Ligand binder design. Structure first.
Ligand code: HEM
Ligand code: HEM
Ligand code: CA
Length: 742
C-alpha cells in the first residue's frame, strides 16, 4: 500500500484461514467415521477391505457420483438416495430373514408386539458394532451377512440390464447399464454397504451415531435428539441477534454530516474513450449469453428426464446422453456462465478505475484468456461425456473426467486450467489496480481490502487441490462444502457487492461511505468469517460435540451480509429524473430491484426456514434444497450477471439502441416464470413429501411407491408450464443481445 505494506498483508489473511483449514481438516481426519480394514464376519470367513471400498468409491465417482442420487442426502433428487433405500431394504431383508428362522413368515404378517421384540433385538445389535478400538474389524453377524449379501443382489440387478427392472431403472432415470463390469458392481455394493453401515452404528461411548441418526427411521429408532432442538433454538437466537445488531450498527454509523452530493448531468464512464481491449469484449458477452441459452436448453432436457422416459417422443439416444451427464452440464455451465459474466464485468471496470490507461499487450491477454475459457469448458464437457460413456479406464477419470461431486466435478487437469485462468484474470486485475495505488492519494482505505478480497478469491482456490481421489467421503465433503462456501458466498457475493458499490458511487446514489462500510462488512464477514459456516452441513456427516457446538452457533453467521437496498430505490429512486440518461439505465436497475426481491424470497425466508438442523433433518435431500438453489442462484446472481451484461452492452454499443418493449417481456417474464416454477410446483411437492417423511420416514419420500402417487406426478408434469415461459423469456433476452452485437 504505502510502502508495499497493504499488498503484503495479503499473505496474513491467507495464513490465518489456511491454518483454520489445516486445523479443521486435521480434526475431520480421524475424527471421521472410520473405514474398517476388513469386514470380519462371525462365522470365520473374511469379506472385502479398504482397497475394495476405495475402488468402489472410485467406480461410484465414475458413474456420476452425486449426480445419480445422493450419499447422505447431498446431491441429486430423481433417484433414491443410496444411504436410505439401502438402509430400509437391508432392514426389511433382516426382518424377513429373522421371521424365517423363528416363524417362517413375512414381516407385516406378524403382530406388532412381535415386530417390537425384533426391533428391540435390532437395537440390541445395531447400537454396538465397531472395530477393535478402531482396529479395522467388524465382527459381523451371519444373519446380517446373509441379509447384506441378499440385498446385494438387488443392486447387482439394478445396473446389469435386468429385463424385469425396466419398471425401476427408467423410473429412477438411469441408462440401461450405467456400469458394465461385474467387479465394479461388487465394489459399488460394498461402498453402499459401508455408507449405510456408518449410519447404522452408534459413536464410541455416546448413544448417537456417526451421522447423528441421519434418516427419520423409527424401525431403528432414529429420532433426533435433545441437543438437536437446543442448538436449533440457539441458531435461531444467533440469526435474530445477527440481523438486529447489524441494523443497529448501520443506524449508529449512518449519522453522516448531511453532505448531499449533487449528481452530474453526464456519465463519467462514457465520457472517457474506449480501448480495443474494451471493444474486444463482444465475444465474451456472446459466450456469456450463449452458455446461458445452452444451460436453459439442458435444463429443459433434464425436465423431460424428470417427467417422461428416455426416448423423448421417439427412439432413445439417452444411451449417449443420460441424466447424470445433462445434470452435470446444467450445473457446471450454470456456474461457468455466471462466473464469466462477472469476470467480464470486472475486467471492464478495471481500466476505467485506472483513468482508462492500460498495460502492455492487453487485448492479446484478454483473447488468450477467452480462448482458454472456451477450451476449458469444451474439454471439461468432453471429459464428462467420455467419462460417463465408460470410454475411460478407472485411472484418469479423476484427472481427465467427471470427478463426481456437485459443483466440483470438473477434471483435475481442467481444474488446473480453470485455476490458471482465474490467476490470469488476477494478473489483469493487479495490472489494473496497482497503477492506481502507486499514485499518491488518500483512498487507501477500501482499496487494500478490495485487493485482499480479490486475492482471497482464488488463493482459497488452492483448496481445490490438497485432496486426492482416494480419500474419505466426509473429508471430501468438508472440502466440497468448502468450495461452495466460497464459490457462491465469495466473489459472487463480495465481488458483486463491491461492483455494485462502484456502480452506485458513479451514479451517486450512495453516500460513497456506506458503500465502504458495506464492502468492509462484506469483506470481513467472509475473509475472517468464511471458514466455519461449512459446519452447518458437516454436522450431519461426522461431527463430535465441540464441532457441533461451533457449527450451530458459528454457522448461522452467513445470513446477514447481503442487502444495501431498502435505503435506495424507494427514496433515492423517488428523487429520480435528475439526470436524463437514466432512461437508458432503467432496465439494468430493474435487475437491481429484482436482486433485492429474491433476496427477501430466496434466503430471506426460505434460507432460515431450512437452516436449523431439526428443520434440516427431515429436508436435507428433498425437493426443498433445489427450491433454495433455483430461487437463490438465478434469483440473485442470475440477475446480477445479466444486469451487468445489459449494462456493458449499453457501454460498448452506445449508438446501437437497446430496443426496449421486448426486454420488458424478457425481464418481467423471467422473474415471474422463475416464481411460477418455484412457488407452484417444487415447493408443494417438497411439503407433501416433507409431511410424508415426518409421517412415515425418509426412505419413503424417495421411493417410487411414493413418487408415483399421481398427484405429485401431475404436479411435476405441471412443472413444465412455467419452464416454457422461462425459456421464452430467456430466448427473447438472447435474441436481444445478439441483435445488439453487430
Ligand atoms: C429455466 C430453465 C431451467 C430448467 C428447466 C432447470 C432444470 C432444473 C431441475 C429439474 C433441477 C432439479 C433437478 C432435480 O430435482 O433432481 C434444477 C436444479 C438446479 N438448477 Fe436448474 N433449471 C433451469 C434454470 C436454471 C438456472 C437459470 C440456474 C442458474 C444459473 C440453474 C441452476 C440450478 C442449480 C444450481 C440447481 C441445483 C441442482 C442440485 O443441487 O441438485 N437452473 N434445475
Ligand atoms: C445468497 C447466496 C446463496 C446462494 C446462491 C445459495 C445457494 C445454495 C444452493 C444452490 C444450495 C444447494 C447446494 C447443493 O447442490 O447441494 C445451497 C445449500 C444450502 N444453503 Fe444456500 N445459498 C446462499 C446462502 C445461504 C444462506 C444465507 C443460507 C442460510 C442463512 C443458506 C442455507 C443453505 C442450506 C441450509 C443449504 C443446504 C441445502 C442442501 O444441502 O442441499 N444458504 N445454497
Ligand atoms: Ca445437491
Amino acid at each position: 500500500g504505502p510502502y508495499r505494506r497493504l499488498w503484503f498483508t495479503l499473505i496474513a489473511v491467507l495464513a490465518v484461514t489456511f491454518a483454520l483449514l489445516g486445523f479443521y481438516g486435521g480434526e475431520v481426519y480421524r475424527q471421521a467415521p472410520p473405514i474398517p480394514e476388513e469386514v470380519a464376519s462371525a462365522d470365520g470367513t473374511r469379506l472385502f477391505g479398504r482397497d475394495d471400498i476405495l475402488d468402489g468409491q472410485t467406480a461410484w465417482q465414475s458413474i456420476g457420483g452425486m449426480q445419480l442420487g445422493s450419499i447422505w442426502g447431498h446431491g441429486a433428487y430423481q433417484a433414491p438416495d443410496w444411504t436410505a433405500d439401502w438402509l430400509h431394504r437391508e432392514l426389511m431383508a433382516w426382518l424377513d430373514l429373522a421371521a424365517r428362522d423363528a416363524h417362517g413368515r413375512d414381516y407385516g404378517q406378524l403382530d406388532a408386539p412381535a415386530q417390537a421384540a425384533l426391533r428391540e433385538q435390532l437395537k440390541a445389535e445395531y447400537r454396538a458394532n465397531r472395530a477393535d478400538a478402531a482396529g479395522g474389524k467388524l465382527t459381523l453377524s451371519p444373519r446380517r451377512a446373509q441379509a447384506v449379501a441378499q440385498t446385494e443382489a438387488y443392486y447387482d440387478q439394478l445396473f446389469s440390464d435386468a429385463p424385469a427392472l425396466h419398471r425401476s431403472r427408467e423410473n429412477y432415470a438411469m441408462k440401461e447399464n450405467t456400469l458394465p463390469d461385474a467387479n465394479r458392481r461388487r465394489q459399488m455394493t460394498h461402498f453402499f454397504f459401508w455408507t449405510a453401515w456408518a449410519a447404522g452404528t452408534e459413536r464410541e461411548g455416546t448413544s448417537v451415531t456417526y451421522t447423528n441418526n441421519w434418516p427419520h427411521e423409527p424401525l431403528i429408532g432414529n429420532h433426533p435428539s435433545s441437543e438437536n432442538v437446543m442448538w436449533s433454538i440457539i441458531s435461531v437466537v444467533v440469526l435474530l441477534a445477527g440481523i438486529g445488531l447489524l441494523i443497529w450498527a448501520w443506524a449508529f454509523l449512518r449519522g453522516k454530516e448531511e453532505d448531499e452530493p449533487p449528481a452530474p448531468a453526464r456519465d463519467p464512464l462514457t465520457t472517457f474513450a474506449l480501448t480495443p481491449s474494451q471493444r474486444a469484449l463482444g465475444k465474451y458477452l456472446f459466450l456469456v449469453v450463449a452458455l446461458f441459452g445452452f444451460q436453459v436448453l439442458l435444463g429443459g432436457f433434464t425436465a423431460h428426464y424428470t417427467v417422461e422416459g428416455q426416448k423423448f417422443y421417439g427412439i432413445d439416444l439417452s444411451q449417449w446422453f443420460p441424466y447424470s451427464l445433462v445434470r452435470t452440464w446444467h450445473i457446471q455451465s450454470a456456474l461457468f456462465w455466471i462466473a464469466t459474466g462477472f469476470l467480464a464485468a470486472g475486467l471492464f471496470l478495471a481500466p476505467l478505475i485506472n483513468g482508462g490507461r492500460d498495460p502492455k499487450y492487453q487485448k492479446a491477454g484478454v483473447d488468450i484468456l477467452f480462448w482458454a475459457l472456451v477450451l476449458v469448458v469444451v474439454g471439461s464437457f468432453a471429459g464428462n461425456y467420455l467419462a460417463i460413456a465408460q470410454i475411460m479406464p478407472p485411472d484418469l477419470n479423476f484427472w481427465l473426467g467427471h470427478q463426481g461431486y456437485e459443483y466440483v466435478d470438473l477434471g483435475r487437469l481442467w481444474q488446473i486450467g480453470k485455476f490458471a485462468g482465474i490467476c490470469f484474470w488476477l494478473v489483469l486485475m493487479l495490472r489494473g489496480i496497482v497503477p492506481a495505488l502507486r499514485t499518491p492519494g488518500g483512498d487507501k482505505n477500501l482499496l487494500a481490502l478490495l485487493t485482499a478480497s480479490v486475492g482471497a478469491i482464488g488463493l482459497f482456490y488452492g483448496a481445490g487441490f490438497f485432496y486426492g481421489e482416494r480419500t474419505h467421503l466426509t473429508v471430501m465433503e468438508y472440502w466440497r462444502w468448502w468450495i461452495v462456501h466460497l464459490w457462491v458466498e465469495g466473489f459472487f457475493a463480495v465481488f458483486a457487492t463491491t461492483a455494485l458499490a462502484f456502480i452506485f458511487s458513479t451514479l451517486g446514489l450512495v453516500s460513497r461511505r456506506m458503500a465502504t462500510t458495506a464492502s468492509l462488512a462484506s469483506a470481513s464477514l467472509f475473509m475472517l468469517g468464511g471458514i466455519p459456516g461449512t459446519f452447518h452441513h458437516l454436522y450431519f456427516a461426522g461431527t463430535t460435540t465441540p464441532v457441533m457446538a461451533v457449527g450451530a452457533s458459528f454457522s448461522a453467521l452467513e445470513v446477514v451480509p447481503l442487502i444495501v437496498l431498502g435505503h435506495e430505490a424507494w427514496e433515492n429512486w423517488r428523487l429520480k429524473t435528475r439526470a436524463p440518461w437514466m432512461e437508458n439505465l432503467k432496465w439494468p436497475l430493474m435487475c437491481f430491484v429484482a436482486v433485492a426481491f429474491w433476496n427477501m424470497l430466496g434466503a430471506g425466508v426460505f434460507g432460515f426456514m431450512i437452516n436449523p438442523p431439526v428443520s434440516l433433518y427431515y429436508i436435507q435431500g428433498l425437493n426443498t434444497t433445489p427450491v433454495h438453489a433455483h430461487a437463490a442462484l438465478f434469483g440473485v446472481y442470475g440477475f446480477l450477471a445479466l444486469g451487468f451484461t445489459l449494462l456493458v452492452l449499453r457501454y460498448i454499443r452506445p449508438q446501437y439502441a437497446l430496443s426496449p418493449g421486448l426486454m420488458k417481456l424478457a425481464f418481467w417474464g423471467l422473474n415471474l416464470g422463475l416464481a411460477l416454477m418455484i412457488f407452484t410446483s417444487l415447493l408443494p411437492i417438497g411439503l407433501i413429501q416433507f409431511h410424508a417423511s415426518v409421517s412415515e420416514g425418509m426412505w419413503y419420500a424417495r421411493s417410487e411407491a411414493f413418487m408415483q402417487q399421481d398427484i405429485l406426478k401431475t404436479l411435476r408434469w405441471g412443472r413444465t408450464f412455467g419452464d416454457v415461459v422461462f425459456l421464452l423469456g430467456a430466448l427473447a433476452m438472447v435474441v436481444q443481445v445478439i441483435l445488439g452485437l453487430l
